[PDB]
A paper describes a structure:
Degradative or 3-ketoacyl-CoA thiolases are involved in the thiolytic breakdown of β-ketoacyl-CoA to acetyl-CoA and shorter acyl CoA molecule and can accommodate long acyl chain substrates. In this study, a degradative thiolase, β-ketoadipyl-CoA thiolase (PcaF) from the β-ketoadipate pathway is explored. The pcaF gene is located in the gene cluster pcaRKF and encodes the last enzyme of the β-ketoadipate pathway involved in the conversion of β-ketoadipyl-CoA into succinyl-CoA and acetyl-CoA (TCA cycle intermediates). The overall structural assembly of PcaF monomer comprises of an α/β topology β1α1β2α2β3α3β4β5 together forming a characteristic five layered thiolase superfamily arrangement,.
The asymmetric crystallographic unit contains four identical monomers with solvent content 48.45%. The four molecules of PcaF in an asymmetric unit forms a tetramer with an extensive buried surface area of 21130 Å2 which is 2.5 time larger than that of PcaF dimer as calculated using PISA (Protein interfaces, surfaces and assemblies, Krissinel and Henrick, 2007). The monomers B and C have a continuous density for residues −2 to 400 unlike A and D subunits that lack density for residues 212–215. Each monomer is comprised of the N-domain (residues 1–119 and 256–278), the C-domain (residues 279–400) and the loop-domain (residues 120–255). PcaF active site architecture comprises of N241, 325F, S162, M163, M294, S253, V255, H356 and I145. In the case of PcaF, it is occupied by S162 where the residue is flipped away from the active site cavity and consequently cannot act as an anchor. As hypothesized in the degradative thiolase PcaF, an interconnected network of tunnels with a long continuous channel running across the dimer is revealed using the program CAVER. Thus, the tunnel sizes of a single monomer (monomer-A) were independently calculated using CASTp wherein two major tunnels were observed with surface area 154 Å2 and 235 Å2 respectively. The second tunnel with 235 Å2 surface area is located near the covering loop. In PcaF, the covering loop is formed by the loop-domain residues ranging from 143 to 163.
Author numbering:
A (entry chain D): 1 to 211, 216 to 400
B (entry chain A): 0 to 211, 216 to 400
C (entry chain C), D (entry chain B): -2 to 400
The structure:
Amino acid sequence: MHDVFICDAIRTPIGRFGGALASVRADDLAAVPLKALIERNPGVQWDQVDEVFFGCANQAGEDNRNVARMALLLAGLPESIPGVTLNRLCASGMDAVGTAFRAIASGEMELVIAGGVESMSRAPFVMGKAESAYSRNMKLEDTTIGWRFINPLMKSQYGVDSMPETADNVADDYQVSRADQDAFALRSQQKAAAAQAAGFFAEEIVPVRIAEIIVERDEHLRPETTLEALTKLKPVNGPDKTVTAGNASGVNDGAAAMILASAAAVKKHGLTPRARVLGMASGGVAPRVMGIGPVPAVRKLTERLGIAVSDFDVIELNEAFASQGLAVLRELGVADDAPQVNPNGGAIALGHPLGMSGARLVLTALHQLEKSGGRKGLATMCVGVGQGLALAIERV
Amino acid sequence: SMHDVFICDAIRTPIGRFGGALASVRADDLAAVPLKALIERNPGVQWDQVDEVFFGCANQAGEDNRNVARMALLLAGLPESIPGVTLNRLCASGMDAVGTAFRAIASGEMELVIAGGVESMSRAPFVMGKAESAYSRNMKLEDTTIGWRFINPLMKSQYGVDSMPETADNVADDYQVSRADQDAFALRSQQKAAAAQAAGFFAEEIVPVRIAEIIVERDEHLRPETTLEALTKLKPVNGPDKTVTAGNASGVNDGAAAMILASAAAVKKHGLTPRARVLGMASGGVAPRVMGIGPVPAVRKLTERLGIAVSDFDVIELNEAFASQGLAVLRELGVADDAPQVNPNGGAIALGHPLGMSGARLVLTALHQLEKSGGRKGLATMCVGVGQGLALAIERV
Amino acid sequence: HQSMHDVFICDAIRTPIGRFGGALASVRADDLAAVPLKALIERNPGVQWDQVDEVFFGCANQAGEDNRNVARMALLLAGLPESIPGVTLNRLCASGMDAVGTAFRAIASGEMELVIAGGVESMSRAPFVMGKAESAYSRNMKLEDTTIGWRFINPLMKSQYGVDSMPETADNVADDYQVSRADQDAFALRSQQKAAAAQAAGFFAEEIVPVRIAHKKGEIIVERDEHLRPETTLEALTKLKPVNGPDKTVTAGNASGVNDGAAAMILASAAAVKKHGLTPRARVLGMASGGVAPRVMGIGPVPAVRKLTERLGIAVSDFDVIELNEAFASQGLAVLRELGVADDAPQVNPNGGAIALGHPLGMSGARLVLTALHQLEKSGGRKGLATMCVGVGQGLALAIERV
Amino acid sequence: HQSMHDVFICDAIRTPIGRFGGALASVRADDLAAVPLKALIERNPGVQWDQVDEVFFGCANQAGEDNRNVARMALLLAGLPESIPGVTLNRLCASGMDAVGTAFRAIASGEMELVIAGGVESMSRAPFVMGKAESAYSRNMKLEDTTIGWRFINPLMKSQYGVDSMPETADNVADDYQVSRADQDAFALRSQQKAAAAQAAGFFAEEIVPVRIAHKKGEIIVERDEHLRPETTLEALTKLKPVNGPDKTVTAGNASGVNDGAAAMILASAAAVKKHGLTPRARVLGMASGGVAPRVMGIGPVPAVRKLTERLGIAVSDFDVIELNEAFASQGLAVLRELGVADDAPQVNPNGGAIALGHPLGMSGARLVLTALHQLEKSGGRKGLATMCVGVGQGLALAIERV
Ligand SMILES: [Cl-]
Ligand SMILES: [Cl-]
Ligand SMILES: [Cl-]
Ligand SMILES: [Cl-]
Ligand SMILES: [Cl-]
């Protein structure tokens, strides 16, 4: 096995639906971090990149037909560089990092780029083909988020709960109160606003130029959030439920990318190694409670590595919904407000462009370890239709 | 330390023609067919111990949306505790699933996995971009069956957006592959596939698809009736001075395939029969305009790292997207146009090409053929739209 | 002051009526509309065609190949001179009849002398429609079928009037006017029996021009109406399930279908009859329209017939033929009952109706006029009434007298 | 009695005309059609509304929220009694004028006494259309825009007549009839100047019912026609580039645009005027249509005017107002020249026309009639002519006389 080092990493700001990045095609957006990596790392011989791996949950729109390859070509990497796109919905960008790790670890590759993209603003409508001449049964479905082309067999066996519905199932089954979710959301807003003001996100961000407007800041943050404002919101799924627009992430646009390399490649390309990847693990759960998916993923990873959850100096836990973030922490024995968890806030504040988020969590965990002087970091997130993914790193 | 990785049982659906025998089957349900078969066929496996299902799929806009690997494993009746992930390297997706599964076991992260691929090109949906402005008159529906959609003006101006048949004419022109040679290659594919079908070779690979019942059991795309004279009469797709025709190109098709990969420890624990060890996978990039010679850098990269000459392989499964690029690849790698180890059971010109499933089929058929021929090493390689190649090597145990 | 002019119907001709996705499904609406126009040209060689004042066509859809004024499209495709104007009318189900009555008013008022009136519908080829986005990045895009029934539903229409489907309104009529399932089925059976008899007798064949269809290995013709179910029995009708649920009454067997077809006829003043060597067959007496609640649209003919007969001073019982469109048996019976005509009165639909023959919306009303006249000629009757209901709650009625 | 009845236009009203995607773009076509109907109700409180015989509306599209007989949809949304029937006419650009003439013929022939005629178009909201698959798993699905222009093109129409866009036809007219770029631009400038003056004088305000629109922070009222470019100068028009290339003459500045609007007016027999307390303003004299080659559709008004004037015995020079639709300055001028009227004759479009005001197809023809009448009243003129061209090669003309 070879050690695998994460080197430079960079991301776009995250835009609101229909907001600052809505005019940027997914393929063009994915190319922005790749162009930045090139500019930032002048020792690299770019013809020696073995592969670009990108996560993307949609792939029906301008991200169609292997967006990783489209993006590397738009970014001006050589046409000799291959690319492949991953889809594990919400966890896609993290899967790209872990898959990139496995490829180097197994000695198949030396120098790779891993990232993720989503343009949920620009997600297309889809229409199935007619199954008979003169069919009257043609319909358009929205690919922005959630179920489309529903399978009756899936509905009858597992249900087709919307993501907020699953988050309410978790709140119910795991006993997570409305008040606890609102406090978690408020802390996310507060920590993200502080991190933004400190310039932490600015160090992770490459601005996007739109032909020229410059988009430099994450757009989704609500720094003025207060507990009173959150308490007044009506639950999405009816008055007896707990999940609201204020204690859940949104749909968003963004891209992120990072360099991974073997020891030999770090030396050859003049890279700065920042952390080594320890491992990645996945787990599956009932679709109806997909939010709890990180629990088996984290347990699998930590048991194989023999590292206690309490040993991590940062835990970046995706905040798809406060209810599931809290439920996961509670099962793993971590306090709802533990200082190592999401110290710069998370997706409730920052937004959630599905394919990008998992790459962002890895790069931000590493960034946070560097600033805090921490050693081990854990990134983990839930996945639609009942999965979890977890990835651990260690600063060098 | 690295672990050896063994391919065990492997199975596929038949390949359907566009709008043909499998056109009524949702891609997710179709992907679930080989999964259910692996379950029925391998009674010793403790199925709650599968670490991951990896599936290739090039489209993902239709009933294969939102991570078809996970959708299929749930529809196949595998426990909800088993994770799944879907890979897209267009034409090579299914082979990428196998190579990705291999790397997960080889690195010690997993012990028992399923790798496969699916495509329902019959059912590929139309797509329409959202309006960029209120009352926009610029709304357009685009076919996702095959080829470019949502064309990026910057891709077109830098690299061109040549259709797959256009890229195959570019390869024919640049590598000097004659119409006559292309037609001869296509005839050989038809004759070899027809012979393999008759010998029951494909039946050993095929699990039937049940449609609520009608049962689909046979590969539908083959044209055993093909003659050189009929091929010679066809007009080139892209105009009179070109060479690629419907008869020297593959088609658009439906199908799924899956196979078990396992560490030595998992082979023992689950009572599996190891059939080959995976040696490695490599990828390569080329200009989009000549995507069909993509396999050349991929094969050169893999063979140089493994220290195995191309001439050392006992079978070469080279995908036949187009006769022109099949021949160009062989010539570049120093292999005869009719070498007996290449595509001995025929290939995509006869069998069809459901993008996401094809690369998984090539791996499992290369293995099948090694067993039939008593061969040792096998190479599967294929081209990829927008200019890539992928290659994967196995050795029979 | 100026005297009103008498208006005569001369030759008339129709295509066969095709089943949805059936014999005429490959024929564009505009080309289909041109088929009876071409037949009229072939059939009447004394006519100086550059003297046609107007072509009026009914068409309920106009979103598909029938877009942008199908009347004008059809006349040009039929080879009529480009100097001839055309206009398309839409009163849904009654459009074809409205074309005839509108042509009649144009001649009666002295504005024209020689006109063609007809109707067309290709329901097979009716397209889907999609509204534009109201905002950038809208998630609210929808595709809707235009074959039949509501699309782009207005919330105010739904709250004030409802948006009942056509079969739902037929059930409302059956409920309100108390028309039994048994009576509906008996009516449908009589329609199939009478149409089967008329077809065997060659009655429809006298109305029909065949349609040429492009085909591998050489073009073929469609010669016969395709919708008829001559082998229908009471037992088979009784076994069908109601479309809207177990305690409803309207079924696929006691309702018309969705269908393809076109029809056209010449109307002329006395002077034009003389100039063009035409054979006048009937004088048009008048047309009237009526409105009713949308939820019971099938009863629309009742105010329309009352309006027309009271203005003309003719009792309903005085007509020798009544062609009442059979959108649904429930509404056909309800209309007859309100008007004091027996459920099986011999002068009503004597050659059957849309339950057997089918209902391509824009053509049906023209068909009813030409077939009423045809029947008057075969029976030696004098006065004819054609009437039909209209979606969203109307009725239309037109009276003719054989000459 | 057997004489034709005189037919009077009484009250008339219209919405402002909106730009594409502009001030009225959020109003559904059916709701927009209802706006002038609701105004007519408030404005004419002597009318017994359940005695209206028919509502006739022009509408060129009918695929969108205007589907399924917008006349009937609009009257129900306006709160008119459900007993009132309605019918929709399509002669493309001339639909709303055809509604008026058709309403006239219905009363003149003695079949009705009290009607509403009007027109509507919402080109902003015109939908996309998609043909059905003609085979299972068809890859040949596509969307076409119904905003304006050809869709579902028939290969036979293309081969025999061409499928020239409307600006291409306007260039053909400019070429064939020799209308210079300079003259087109001068005509366009006169239209803007006269419309700006009429607007400033409050002339359009007398024709307009304002439309209330909701915004986030409260409601606004759209009161004014949005299309006008009062800042237009010859120098500005001179710098525009021709739509169809450099030896061509038609530009965005010498052509109308695409637009949204609706209009309606009451027509009544003398007996209905007396019973419903109406104020008669003009008598309708008659309407005539004509056809020309599609490729020069802009010249269509010439046969139409010739036919109407010959039948009525009224010379073109006898009219105190001529409202000639300004689809394109090239065809406007060509028509005037063929009819023997000076390019800048003071009786022609005295308050400007569609280059300034915009052209919501189905509405325009109704607007021309009501504005001709309005102008006759202001100027003390007696007879008025409204005429316009039609896509695919027609013209329509309608004459009125102030009472
Ligand atoms: Cl989703
Ligand atoms: Cl493709
Ligand atoms: Cl309907
Ligand atoms: Cl148009
Ligand atoms: Cl005026």
